[PDB]
Each structure stands twice: as C-alpha cells, then as structure tokens.
Amino acid sequence: QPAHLCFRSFVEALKVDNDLVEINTPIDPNLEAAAITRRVCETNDKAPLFNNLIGMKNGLFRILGAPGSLRKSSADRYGRLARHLALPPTASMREILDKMLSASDMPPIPPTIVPTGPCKENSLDDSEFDLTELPVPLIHKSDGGKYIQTYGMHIVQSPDGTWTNWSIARAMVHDKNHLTGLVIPPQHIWQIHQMWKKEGRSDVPWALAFGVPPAAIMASSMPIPDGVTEAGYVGAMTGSSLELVKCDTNDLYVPATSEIVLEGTLSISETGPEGPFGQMHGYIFPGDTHLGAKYKVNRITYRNNAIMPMSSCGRLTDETHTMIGSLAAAEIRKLCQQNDLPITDAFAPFESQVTWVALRVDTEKLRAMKTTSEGFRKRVGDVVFNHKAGYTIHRLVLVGDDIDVYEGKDVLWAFSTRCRPGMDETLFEDVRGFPLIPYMGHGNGPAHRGGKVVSDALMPTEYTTGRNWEAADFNQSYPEDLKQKVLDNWTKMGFS
Amino acid sequence: QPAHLCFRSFVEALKVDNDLVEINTPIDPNLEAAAITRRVCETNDKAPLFNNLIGMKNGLFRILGAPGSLRKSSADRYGRLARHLALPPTASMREILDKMLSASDMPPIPPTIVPTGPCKENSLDDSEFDLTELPVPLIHKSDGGKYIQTYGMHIVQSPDGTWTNWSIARAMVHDKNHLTGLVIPPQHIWQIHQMWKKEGRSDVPWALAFGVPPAAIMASSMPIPDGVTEAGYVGAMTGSSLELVKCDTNDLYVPATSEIVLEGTLSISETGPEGPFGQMHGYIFPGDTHLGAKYKVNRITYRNNAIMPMSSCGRLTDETHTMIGSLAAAEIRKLCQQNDLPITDAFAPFESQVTWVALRVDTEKLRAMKTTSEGFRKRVGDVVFNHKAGYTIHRLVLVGDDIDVYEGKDVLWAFSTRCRPGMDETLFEDVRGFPLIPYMGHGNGPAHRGGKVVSDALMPTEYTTGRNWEAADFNQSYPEDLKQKVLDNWTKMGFS
Ligand SMILES: Cc1cc2c3c(c1C)C(C)(C)CC=[N+]3c1c([nH]c(=O)[nH]c1=O)N2C[C@H](O)[C@H](O)[C@H](O)COP(=O)(O)O
Ligand SMILES: Cc1cc2c3c(c1C)C(C)(C)CC=[N+]3c1c([nH]c(=O)[nH]c1=O)N2C[C@H](O)[C@H](O)[C@H](O)COP(=O)(O)O
Ligand SMILES: [K+]
Ligand SMILES: [K+]
Ligand SMILES: [K+]
Ligand SMILES: [K+]
Ligand SMILES: [Mn+2]
Ligand SMILES: [Mn+2]
C-alpha cells in the first residue's frame, strides 16, 4: 500500500528517506520518549521510532514521534508532510495546502467497506485490557494524565447517519477503561456530541483510530466544512476510495490498516478530570485541571507490532504548528475567495505561534473595489472571525503582492513597517475566542470571546493607484545586470 | 593606536580577525560598491574594503562597507561591533550595551587638543575640490543623490560653546561645494541648529568627520542626553581623553586620526532638494524629494590613502539596525530605571525592523508595586514615548523574567502568546512619531504624531503572586537528569 494510504508504509517511507531514527534499546514512556521527540521538534531532526518501549506487552505498542514535524534542510523542509499526501518531498507549502484544498471542488469519493484488514490482527475485550497498564506516554512533566491521544482520529457520526466526522482532539487515560479529553465548541466532535445530547437517548457511538492513513490524519486536522464527511473528502483528494472495516462492537467504520483502534462510547452525561497538557502555544499551567468529556473503551483491536504515533507538542515546531496552523490558513484562503475577497494565499506564521494568519491580497483586484482600509478590514474580519475556520486565529495580517506569506521574515517585515498600530487595525471583541491561547484562558478578559484583530499592512496606494516604493534590498535596489555581475564575481572576490 | 580609538587601526583589526575582504580591482561607486555591501549585510558576510574605486583621485577615497554589521557565526555575531569598543569579539549584546551606558555614571573626560594629526596629511581648499568629481557612491538605484554621508559624524556646537554634539545624520552631494541632508526634530543637530537660527546672526559652524574613532561613531549613533558632549562621554567610556585637532577654517575640533574631514557651515536660512534614500526600514519611495538642510563645504582635509566608511542600509541587517535600534534600546533601559521602573534589559528586535523595543521586567519588583497592566503600561509609555530616546520606537513590549529580550524568537513568542490584542495594549496618539517608518510618513495618519503602543506581554499572575506556568519545551518540561541523559545519548541514538 502506498505511504499516503497506510501508516505502516509511511513509516517505511520515512526510513527509506533517511528521515527516521530507529531506537531499539528500551525507552521509558514516562517522559523519555516525549523528551527525545521534543528535542527532535525543536531541532528539526529525524523522526524517532521507539521500537522498545518499557512496559510494552499484549504487543502494544511501539511509538513514532514527530510524524508531521519539519526536516532540517530548506529544500525538503516540509517533506514529512509531503509524504502524508503522495507529493514530492520538495513540495512547497503552497503545493501542500493546494492539495489539501483540492477536494473542496470535487465530488466526494465515498469509502469502500472491506471485510477485514490489518487492524483486526489482534483484539482485547473488556476483560483483557487495562489502559493504565499500557505504555501510554507522559508527554510533559506537569501533565495531568498520560496522553494516549495526540495523533489519532476520533470517529463520530450524526444521529441521522448522514455525517461521519474524523478529527484530532486530545485525550488522556482516566482509568482502566475510560479516557477523558477536550470536546469544545465549535469543533465538529462537539457539534455531533450536542446532537446526541439533544436526542437524549444514548451515549455517542465512538471509535479512535491511531496510525491511520496519513492522508486521513491530515484531513482530520483541517476545518473542512460542517456536515462534510472527511472520508469522502480524503477519497476525492487522493483519487481513491478509502478502504474501511466495521468496528466489532458498533457500526462505525475505521481505516482497514489502522495500527490501533479503540471502540466505545463518548458520554452524553459524564465528565472527568482532564488536563492540564503542554499545548500548542508552548505552555502548561500545572494543576489547571478541569472537567472534560469522558469516553468508555469496550474493545481494542490492533496490528501485529502496532505503532502509536505521538505529538510531543509545545514550543516550535511540531504537528500543532505545521498542521493546525497551516490547514486553518488553507481553509481561510478558500473561505475568503468564496466571499469574493481578493486573497491569493494564506499562511499562519510559525513565528506567531500560529496565532496569526497572513493574507496575501491581489492588489489589482483590490484597486478595482475602490474601497478603504477601514471597510476592507472590517469585511475580512467579519468573514473570517465569524467562521469556524477562523477559530484558532487571533490576528489577520493583510499584505500586498510583494510579500511571500510562507516566509515569516517577510510577514514580520510587512507587519512592522506597513501597519500603523491602532489606526490601521480593527479589533473584534464580539467573536468567538480561542481559550487555549494563554492571553485568553489565563488572561485578563473573557476566555471565550474577543481578543481578535485585523492588522492592515497594505500601504495607502495599494488601494488606489498601485505600489509606490521599491525595497531597499539587493533584489530591488540594483539593476539586473549588476546583480548578476555581483553574484558571478562573489566567490572570486573572497566572499562565501 | 588601538582599534577603538583609530579607524585605520580598526580596519587592521578586521583583517587580522578574518572579517575583511580586500577588493583591489576597480569597483564602481555608482551602485556596485553598495550592491556588494548590501549583499554582505543580507548574508552576514565579511566587511568589504574597496581599495580601487573608479574615479578615485586627489587620493580620495577608498570605501569600507558594512562597518557595524553582523558576522555569520553565533559565537562572534556582534564582533564588529565589539571591535568598536575594545571588547572581546565574543561579547554579548548585553555587554556591548552596558559598555555604551557605562559613561552615564561617570564624570566626563574632556578631550585633549593636539597640534596635528593624520587627518591633516592632505588638504583641498575651495578652488581645488569638487564634491561632484569625487567617487561618492550611489547607494540605491532610486536615491535622489550620491550619499557621501552614511557613517561620518557631524560636529556642531551650541552658540554659547557649552555643548558640542557628535551625531550621524544622512547627507548627499548638492553641488561642487554643498550637501543637503536630514536635520529633523528632536535630534541634537536640529536642536543646535534651532539655537543658531534664534540667535539669527550666522550660519552654524560645522564639520563632518568620516572614519572617526570607532568608539566615537558608536556614541554618535546613541541618544545620550541633551546637553551632553559626546567627546567627554566617549572619553569616560574608554577611560582615555580623545585627541582632537582644530579645523583650519573654524574653531571646531575633530578627531586627530579622522580619515576625511569636511569643514564649513550648516545654513540657518537655505534648503535644497534631499532624498529620497533607501532607509533603515527597508524602503525607498522614488521621486519623494523634499527640502532638507543645506551645508556649505569650505575645506577638505584627509589622511593619505583615506578610507570612507559606508552603510548600504535597508533590509536586515546593517548599521541602522545594529546601532540605531540597539543604542536607543540601551538608553531606554536606563531612562526606565531612572524613572523607578523595574526594567532590567531592553533590546530592539531585528525582526521588528527595530521599530519595537522589548523591556524585560523584574517581576519581583513589579509584584511589590501592587499595580495593574493598564496603569503600568500607561506609566511606561509616558516615560518612554515622551522622551527623545523613544523617538524611533513605536511599540514597547513588556515581558517577564523568563524572556531573553536579545533573542527575537523569544520576544515573538511572548508577544504572540501573552498579549491580548486591544485589551492588553495602550495606544498613544499624542506623542511624537517617527516619520521615516512607512506607515507614518507614507501612511494613513499624521506623519509626525501618534502611532505608538505599549503591548503588555506580562501574564496576570506576574503582577500578583508569580509565574504560574512552565514552558512546554525541552528545557522546562523535563527533569534535569532526563534532559542530560537525552543529550548524552543523542549522537549514540542516531541524531545530529
Ligand atoms: C494536529 C493536531 C490537531 C489538534 C490537536 C492536536 C494535534 C496534533 C493535539 C492532540 C496534539 C493537541 C490538541 N489538539 C486538539 C485539536 N482540536 C481540538 O478541538 N482539541 C485538541 O485537543 N486539534 C485541532 C483540530 O484537529 C482541528 O481544529 C480540526 O479542524 C478539527 O476537525 P473538525 O473540523 O472536523 O472539528
Ligand atoms: C547608525 C546611523 C544612525 C543614523 C543614520 C544612519 C546610520 C548608519 C544613516 C546615515 C545610514 C541613515 C540615516 N541616519 C540618520 C540618523 N538620525 C537622523 O536624524 N537622521 C539620519 O539621517 N541616525 C540616527 C542617529 O544617529 C541617532 O538618532 C543619534 O541618537 C543622533 O545623535 P543625537 O542624539 O546626538 O542627536
Ligand atoms: K477535520
Ligand atoms: K497600512
Ligand atoms: K549622539
Ligand atoms: K498580558
Ligand atoms: Mn469535520
Ligand atoms: Mn547628542
């Protein structure tokens, strides 16, 4: 099976790329595996595969850390991500996000049911497992639990059967047969939970699949529209129907080659302690436990030699930056274009801890609108900040065509030099806020509302007659023939 | 003579450091010298010494580009700057700025007059030179003139003789015996000019010295207080009285080892076209010429084999970032401490195009103030933004003790995660603005007023009971003994 369609094959691909380190000596799931992975993410090193976990048994489990993190070279920086999607390892971010958006203008390709797959090679019923005995990692020293779920996909379906959602949301072990986790608005797992809670008759049938097809975990991390079944989006994206097998204890369907599958229920009534957790913005507040959603686990199925992927998330750079930020930016680009806004590109700068999105504007199109900064900021912010795709994003930065939004140095340069504080900005207090950002949930104002801004880094003439400056840089302040002469004589002269 | 006291010796030091490239083949002052220098600054390469300028004659002049720019290695990043100050080349930015501040609590050491020096080796009277025939560079393709003055020191004295100021301000050739340049409030050259203009009797006696003692050009770039003679500050800083020789045509005094000296007058009545110029924020607006101050040149004196230093300024990183930003930050640190504010460190992040200063707060001291964000922002912004030291700075970012303000990644992380837009900020519209920033002089509002902000990236408990988080990073989220084990086994395991 190809890498993008089978996690086991993806691990192979990473080896074969010289993008993996296999670690066959014992590694402790209590902090050591995550510490090594954290170091990898902070240095853009090779992904670690821990083949010898302490306390590995019933054959559960090996760990792959840093599955969606960065490579060291500029040329294949995003190669791990490219390998989720059948793209060349030199793919740019534009090409990755275009791939992720491509299915938004295609018919879904619904999944194919098959009778069995590798995820059925082993099973443990509810007298045979104990989640507290498995080698579940402690990821950060102050975490409030062992976070089994950092890179699996939750599967829940609307009561009417018409929407099956796949998404990533964190969860930790509560006791031998339960998890607790985040289930928060406006996320689709929360929207579906609310439908079951309003019907009032039963807990939500649920599955959590770990080590799913890479192309599926990428869609699981993307805010595709309400009501859209990720399986059919991924089918369209990849050009192929995904093969799914039915759960044994419910009627949900899981990828056939899933490494590990939990089957059970998400309660419509019960909660339990959840968190704290070292999170995407780089923080943990020790002791900050709150009531989260509760999950019952009835059955585990798994591949021979199962591998659990793990995100050791926090400070730059990991899956919470490369996937959450970039995939939200992608969806925001599309949303703006569908609202008739002249946005060509969007990206969440890593330097902003993926709390900003830079929007590149087609300024010929903007000029034809015959508008102003105040009006345009206002229009962009209403579209984005009132939509789920904008949930995680607190600052939008509008930039003209000269800026490469995929280059954070250029975004920072534009923001710092073209946006006058206050006057060139519009604050939005009456929109949903992302409480996970420290300045929101641990800050001076409402945790769930406001704190958003549109910062216009378009210069005045970009709305009227066109750009009226040149950069004071090598590229723009010298003619072509001089530039080339300099470059041709560079090493001759003594330079590197 | 030591490097910090004699520019010729500084050039030697750079060679000897393997921090110079000598270029002995002909180089055109029309754009080529500046293009090579621009490339150096954008790549942190070795400083270029152009020993064979096209149109070099009456022995005027060689050029040294990038005199205060960055080196490639992290370990001696600031080494060129250290070599201005007798500091080791591995000096940190803290150590450089402390050196620059050290004289603020010392008696001045006034300069010593000597009868002659190297700057008298050659002379041209006002029938012998022509500024349009010298190899003055065109620095950026769209500049409005050939900017002779990018790294020399203007010397002007108050009418009463009690204050002699040394400062860098740009100037370009107007005609055979005149320059035009920036002379703008609140700068000291402007304050002194105003005193002469109010007296109304004569033009300002003036000299412009190029290739001055390195320690002197650093003080020339720093906003030391009103009324303080830079020569005596530099004397105190260096522990030695500077040797000065009298001008031939006026009673000003110039460093004895100056490479090139212009003597003349700064008009109290006449102006001439000035600019545009590719500037510190990275821009040029072609065609944007305005009336600037006018200077008459009566005499040139110069060293044998004179060397003109040149800043090819623009996008990161050059003297306008390393010196303007950092030296303003230094003075702001001191100003805050003298106003009883608990600021330990200040730096202007390069990533902000030196338009921000990050202020590190001693949060034990802040807690004892028993104050709030609104009040503290307000107090900091009034102190800084109403003072000349704050002129160039439009955003102050307050951070707690865990942040290294000399590390722009950490400043950005703190700003993006700890400062809620709007609520955690105070805008300042009724303060002097820096018109050179594009969003000011070419923006939507008043060019000279407002556009400033204090952004509080202190978290709430930093005002009350103390920091309540740990970072989700390798350093903070894992115990010491684990961290060391990981590091000790890193290359063993397969990592770099
Ligand atoms: C890549 C990724 C995405 C996480 C995520 C993580 C990763 C690695 C973790 C597990 C390491 C840390 C926490 N995560 C959560 C999360 N969304 C959320 O609601 N709760 C979370 O706990 N997300 C974001 C979420 O997957 C996206 O917002 C999706 O758009 C949700 O899918 P949906 O649009 O179908 O609701
Ligand atoms: C290092 C440096 C500093 C420049 C400077 C440049 C460099 C290389 C140039 C020449 C390349 C570009 C323009 N510069 C100007 C300038 N200040 C100003 O008033 N006009 C300028 O044209 N400065 C900043 C100025 O030197 C500081 O604000 C000093 O504090 C001024 O001294 P003062 O406090 O005695 O007035
Ligand atoms: K999803
Ligand atoms: K603007
Ligand atoms: K000065
Ligand atoms: K704050
Ligand atoms: Mn969804
Ligand atoms: Mn001064």
> What's the 3-state SS for chain B?
CCHHHCHHHHHHHHHHCCCEEEECCCECCECHHHHHHHHHHHHCCCEEEECCECCCECCECEEEECCCCCCCCCCCCCHHHHCCCCCCCCCCHHHHHHHHHHHHHCCCCCCEECCCCHHHCEEECCCCCCCCCCCCCECCCCCCCCCCECCCEEEEECCCCCCEEEECCCEEEEECCEEEECCCCCCHHHHHHHHHHHHCCCCEEEEEEECCCHHHHHHHCCCCCCCCCHHHHHHHHHCCCCEEEECCCCCCEEECCCCEEEEEEEEEEEEEEECCCCCCCCEECCCCCEEEEEEEEEEEEECCCCEEEECCCCCCCCHHHHHHHHHHHHHHHHHHHHCCCCEEEEECCHHHCCCEEEEEECHHHHHHHCCCHHHHHHHHHHHHHCCHHHCCCCEEEEECCCCCCCCHHHHHHHHHHHCCCCCCEEEECCCECCCCCHHHHCCCCCCCECCEEEEECCCHHHHCCCCCCEECCHHHHCCHHHHHHHHHHHHHHCCC
User: In angstroms, rounded to a whole number, what is the distance separating the alpha carbons of residues A46 and A32?
Assistant: 16
Gap from CA of B207 to ligand 5 centroid (Å)? 15
Which of A258, A16, A311 minimizes the C-alpha distance to A122?
A258
Task: Please give the torsion angle defined by the CA atoms of residues A380, A383, A385 and A390, in that order, rounded to the nearest 10 degrees.
Answer: -100
Task: For B453, name the nearest residue in chain A, comparing CA atoms only.
Answer: A421
Select the residue of A45, A353, A422 nearest B417 (Cβ to Cβ): A353
DSSP state of A4: G
Least Cα separation, residue A353 to chain B (angstroms): 6
Q: Which residues of B touch A423 (CB under 8 A)?
A: 443-445, 450-451
Beta-carbon separation of A472 and B443 below 8 A: no
The protein residue whose alpha carbon is closest to atom 12 in ligand 1 is A170
- Smallest-distance ligand from the CA of B229: 8
Best of B101, B147, B170 for a ligand 2 pocket test (most atoms within 8 Å of beta carbon): B170
User: Are the Cβ atoms of B351 and A409 closer than 8 angstroms?
Assistant: yes
Contact yes or no for B418 and A438 at CB 8 A: yes
| Residue at A445: amino acid letter | G
* Closest alpha carbon within chain B to A494: B21
- Closest protein CA for atom 7 of ligand 2: B320
- A147: closest CA among A353, A308, A363? A308
Tell me the chain B residues in contact with residue A468 when contact means C-beta distances shorter than 8 Å.
285, 442
* Beta carbons of B418 and A429 less than 8 Å apart: no
Residue contact B429–A442, C-beta within 8 A: no
Provide the β-strand partners of residue B398: B359, B456
Do the Cβ atoms of B151 and B311 come closer than 8 Å? Answer: yes
Query: Determination technique for this PDB entry?
Result: X-ray
Which chain A residues contact residue B313 at CB under 8 A? 472
Q: How far is the CA of A168 from the centre of ligand 7 (A)?
A: 10
Query: Cβ(B70)–Cβ(B78) under 8 Å?
Result: yes
Best residue among B63, B81, B168 to mutate for probing ligand 2's pocket (most ligand atoms within 8 Å of CB) is B168
Structure tokens at B66: 């990038």
Pick among B51, B315, B397, B434 to test the A interface (most A CBs inside 10 A) = B315
Cα A366 to Cα A412, A425, A453, B61, B492: the distances in Å are: 22, 18, 20, 49, 56
Q: Report the SS3 class of residue A205.
A: strand
- Pocket probe mutation, ligand 1, options A149, A165, A168, max atoms within 8 Å of Cβ: A168
Q: What is the DSSP string of A386-440?
A: TSGGGTT--EEEEE-TT--TT-HHHHHHHHHHH--TTTTEEEE-SSB--TTSHHH
Contact B197, B203 (CB under 8 A): no
DSSP string, A101-165: HGGGGS-----EE-S--GGGSEEE-TTT--TTTS-PPB-STT-SS---BSS-EEEEE-TTSS-EE
Ligand 6 centre from B458 Cα, in Å? 5
Non-local (6+) Cβ contacts of B66 within 8 A are B37, B40, B41, B45, B47, B48, B80, B311, B312, B318, B319
Q: How far is residue B32's CA from residue B50's CA, in Å, rounded to a whole number?
A: 10
Write out the H or E segment, with its range, that includes residue A253: strand A253-255
- Within its chain, how far is the Cα of B95 from the centroid? 16
Mark yes or no for CB contact A35/B496 under 8 Å.
no
Query: Looking at CA atoms only, how far is residue A361 from chain B in angstroms?
Result: 18
Distance from the A60 Cα atom to the nearest Cα atom in chain B, whole angstroms: 22
B217/B308 Cα distance (integer angstroms): 13
Half-sphere exposure at residue B38, Cβ-oriented, CA atoms within 13 angstroms: 29
Q: What does the block give as tokens for A273?
A: 């302690």
Q: How many CB pairs under 8 A join A and B?
A: 276
Question: Are the beta carbons of A38 and B452 separated by less than 8 Å?
Answer: no
CA A392 to ligand 1: nearest atom: 28
B168 lines ligand 2 (CB under 6 A): yes
User: How far apart (Å, rounded) are the C-alpha atoms in residues B56 and A299?
Assistant: 86
* Cα Rg, chain B, nearest whole Å: 23
**Tokens read off for A388:** 């789920």
Relative to beta strand A243-246, strand A253-255 is antiparallel
Q: How far is the centre of ligand 6, averaged over its atoms, from the C-alpha of B378 (Å)?
A: 14
Work out which ligand 2 atom sits closest to the CA atom of B220: 32
The partner residue sitting opposite A315, judged by closest CB among B352, B473, B479, is B473
If you take atom 19 of ligand 2, which residue's CA is the nearest one?
B169
Question: Which of left, alpha, beta for A211 (phi over 0: left; psi -120 to 50: alpha)?
Answer: left
- Separation CA A259–CA A217 (nearest Å): 13
Residues B257 and B213: beta-carbon distance below 8 Å = yes
Measured CA to CA, the distance from residue A420 to residue A468 in angstroms comes to 17
For residue B383, what are the contacts with CB-CB under 8 A and spacing of at least 6? Answer: B335, B336, B339, B341
CB within 8 Å: A413 and B282: yes
* Helix or strand run (H / E) with residue A221: none
Radius of gyration of chain A from its Cα atoms, rounded to whole angstroms: 23
Pick the residue from chain B with its C-alpha nearest to A486. Answer: B36
Residue whose CA lies nearest to ligand 1 atom number 11: A150
Please name the member of B46, B140, B355 whose beta carbon is closest to the beta carbon of A472. Answer: B140
- Residues B404, B416: Cα–Cα separation, whole Å: 15
Q: Give the Å distances, CA to CA, from A489 to A493, B30, B69, B137, B200.
A: 6, 17, 21, 20, 54
Give the Å distance between the CA of B125 and the centre of ligand 5: 29
C-alpha B398 – ligand 5 centre gap (Å): 26
B474–A281: do the CB atoms touch at under 8 Å? no
Residue whose CA is at the smallest distance from ligand 2 atom 20: B169
Tokens coding B491? 């290359």
| CB B216 within 8 Å of CB B230 | yes
- Best to test chain A binding among B444, B467, B489 (most A CBs inside 10 Å): B444
Give the resolution to one decimal, in Å.
Answer: 1.1
In contact, A205 and A195? CB cutoff 8 Å = no
Cβ of residue B171 lying under 6 Å from some atom of ligand 2: no
What residues contact B351, with CB distance under 8 A and at least 6 apart?
A351, A409, A412, A416, B408, B411, B412
Evaluate whether A277 touches A170 at the Cβ level (below 8 Å).
yes
The three-point CA angle B215-B219-B221 to 5° equals 120
B354 lines ligand 2 (CB under 6 A): no
Say yes or no for a CB contact (<8 Å) between B469 and A442.
yes
Q: From the CA of B167, give the closest atom in ligand 2.
A: 32
Neighbours of B269 (CB within 10 A): 8
User: What number does the ligand 1 atom closest to the CA of A313 have?
Assistant: 11
Q: Do A424 and B443 touch (CB under 8 A)?
A: yes
For residues B417 and A351, the answer to whether their CB atoms sit within 8 Å is no
Top mutation candidate among A38, A81, A170, A391 for ligand 1, by most atoms within 8 Å of CB: A170
* Identity of residue B467: R
Q: Do A439 and B450 touch (CB under 8 A)?
A: no
Q: Provide φ and ψ at A261, rounded to 5°.
A: -130, 125
Give the nearest partner residue to A469 out of B285, B416, B490, using CB atoms.
Answer: B285
| Nearest CB neighbour to B478, from listed A35, A477, A494 | A35
Alpha carbon dihedral A191, A192, A196, A202, in 10-degree steps, equals -140
